[PDB]
């Protein structure tokens, strides 16, 4: 009964970071060695866990979050970071326990002319709390007069398209990111490594 990591990492389509995807991994045997022993990732950072010791560990549940961001934004998917992504799209807690895995996806997510399907929230009055997902498309009021759903002066559409083209500098190319959260509650452990 293997954990369906293949469904998460090898998904034909990833979510936009503002509407990041969460998959609750539970009741399965998890071989994390298929991930660590893979020359496919540019980023593989773990927090509160050793990456090689993951196969010895047992968790209540594991969460697999996934989205697409720029290469220069992958550094914001870590505890204690600021920026448009950490502040208005996907926020990790300071006591984060889990892994952050990223890889270049220029061959899949960039289009000759611009993709436009991948978005990010550009306007938000306040920063997100950790693991908050805001999918509101309400017109952003930058002044004193209400917008009333009409894009215009001091009334912006809150989301912005990435517009990924294969002629972008590496730090501006699309990157697929999978964040694995490790949950440890006073309840039975449903996700254990191979025994």
């Amino acid at each position, epitope marked *: 009964n293997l954990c369906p990591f293949g469904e998460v990492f090898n998904a034909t389509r990833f979510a936009s970071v503002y509407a990041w995807n969460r998959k609750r991994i539970s009741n399965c045997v998890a071989d994390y060695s298929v991930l660590y022993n893979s020359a496919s990732f540019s980023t593989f950072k773990c927090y509160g866990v050793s990456p090689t010791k993951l196969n010895d560990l047992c968790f209540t549940n594991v969460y697999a979050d996934s989205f697409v961001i*720029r290469g*220069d934004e992958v550094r914001q998917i870590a505890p204690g970071q*600021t*920026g*448009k992504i950490a*502040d*208005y799209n996907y926020k990790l807690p300071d006591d984060f326990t889990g892994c952050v895995i990223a890889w270049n996806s220029n061959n899949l997510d960039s289009k000759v002319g*611009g993709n436009y399907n991948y978005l*990010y929230r*550009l*306007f*938000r*009055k*306040s*920063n997100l709390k950790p693991f908050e997902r805001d999918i509101s498309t309400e017109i952003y*009021q*930058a*002044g*004193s007069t209400p917008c009333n759903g009409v894009e215009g*002066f*001091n009334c*912006y559409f809150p989301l*912005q398209s990435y*517009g*990924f*083209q294969p*002629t*972008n*500098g590496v*730090g*501006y190319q699309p990157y697929r990111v999978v964040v694995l959260s490790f949950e440890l509650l006073h309840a039975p452990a449903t996700v254990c490594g191979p025994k």
Partner: antibody, heavy 120, light 108 residues
Framework: EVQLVESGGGLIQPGGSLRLSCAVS????????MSWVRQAPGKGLEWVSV???????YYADSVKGRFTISRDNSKNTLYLQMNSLRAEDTAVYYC??????????????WGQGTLVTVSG | DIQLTQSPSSLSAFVGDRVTITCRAS??????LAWYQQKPGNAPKLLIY???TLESGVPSRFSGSGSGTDFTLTISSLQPEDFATYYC?????????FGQGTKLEIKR
């Protein structure tokens, strides 16, 4: 009628400190990306710093550790605290609405400017 | 870092001339580019944003085109009030580098 009014500039010796203010009307400072841009005499434009509505701040590498952008939501005013001023900091400083990284709108409204002269 | 090369440094023209100002980024910055106009003793004024979107209130004679590395600002019919310095700006990443500028002067 959007209006951005800078003040606080003037003559100061190298090593000194100065605070610029920018009283705004026409948009809410606390709800916008607000930037500081400067122009040395006879030169081009140079972005200095930005504050996000959420609180995040960024600076240009030439002003890091010496300048601090901030605001007062109640007075709809933006500030720039300039410490350890150097001769090169001599420029007209402009406050503008907008950001310069993944912000396609550019800097749509700018103040008249305030001249800061750093000289001994 | 991203370098923007704006050309020419100066351009000579008459009222009624079609003028094109060029801007070349060192890497693909898609449509993250703005165009500003500045007159001596005055703050810059935004003309075009998102590479080709005309800013509200700006006259129709100003237009921008391009995406990636090569951008252009066109002034289809110069008016007396258009003799000024023009700047391109990359809005892709900090520090939002501005171009060196193009002074548009009177032909003689």
């Amino acid at each position: 009628e959007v209006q951005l009014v800078e003040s606080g500039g003037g003559l100061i010796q190298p090593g000194g400190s100065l605070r610029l203010s920018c009283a705004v009307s026409g948009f809410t400072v606390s709800n916008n990306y607000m930037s500081w841009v400067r122009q040395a005499p006879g030169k081009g434009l140079e972005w200095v710093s930005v504050i996000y509505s959420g609180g995040t701040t960024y600076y240009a590498d030439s002003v890091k550790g010496r300048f601090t952008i901030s605001r007062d939501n109640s007075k709809n005013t933006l500030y720039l605290q300039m410490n350890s001023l150097r001769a090169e900091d001599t420029a007209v400083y402009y406050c503008a609405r907008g950001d310069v990284s993944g912000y396609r709108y550019g800097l749509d409204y700018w103040g008249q400017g305030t001249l800061v002269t750093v000289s001994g | 870092d991203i370098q923007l090369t704006q050309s020419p440094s100066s351009l000579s023209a008459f009222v009624g001339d079609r003028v094109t100002i060029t801007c070349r980024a060192s890497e693909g910055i898609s449509s993250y580019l703005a165009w500003y106009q500045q007159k001596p003793g005055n703050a810059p004024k935004l003309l075009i944003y998102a590479a080709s979107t005309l800013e509200s209130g700006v006259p129709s004679r100003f237009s921008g085109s391009g995406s990636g590395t090569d951008f252009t600002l066109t002034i289809s019919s110069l008016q007396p009030e258009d003799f000024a310095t023009y700047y391109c700006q990359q809005l892709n990443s900090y520090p939002g580098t501005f171009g060196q500028g193009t002074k548009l002067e009177i032909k003689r």
